[PDB]
Amino acid sequence: PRXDPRXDPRXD
């Protein structure tokens, strides 16, 4: 996860 990832971000 890239950029502005919020919450429950997984992966890339």
Coordinates of N, CA and C in Angstrom, one line a residue:
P1 N 0.8 -1.2 0.0 CA 0.0 0.0 0.0 C 0.9 1.3 0.0
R2 N 0.7 2.1 -1.0 CA 1.4 3.3 -1.1 C 0.5 4.5 -1.2
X3 N 1.0 5.7 -1.2 CA 0.2 6.9 -1.3 C -0.1 7.4 0.1
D4 N -1.4 7.4 0.4 CA -1.8 7.8 1.8 C -2.8 6.7 2.2
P5 N -2.3 5.5 2.6 CA -3.1 4.4 2.9 C -3.5 4.4 4.4
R6 N -4.8 4.3 4.6 CA -5.4 4.3 6.0 C -6.3 3.1 6.2
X7 N -6.7 2.8 7.4 CA -7.6 1.8 7.8 C -6.9 0.6 8.1
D8 N -7.0 -0.5 7.4 CA -6.2 -1.7 7.6 C -5.6 -2.1 6.2
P9 N -4.6 -1.3 5.8 CA -4.0 -1.5 4.4 C -3.0 -2.6 4.5
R10 N -3.1 -3.6 3.6 CA -2.1 -4.7 3.5 C -1.6 -4.8 2.1
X11 N -0.6 -5.7 1.9 CA -0.1 -5.9 0.6 C 1.1 -5.0 0.3
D12 N 0.9 -4.1 -0.7 CA 1.9 -3.1 -1.1 C 1.2 -1.8 -1.1

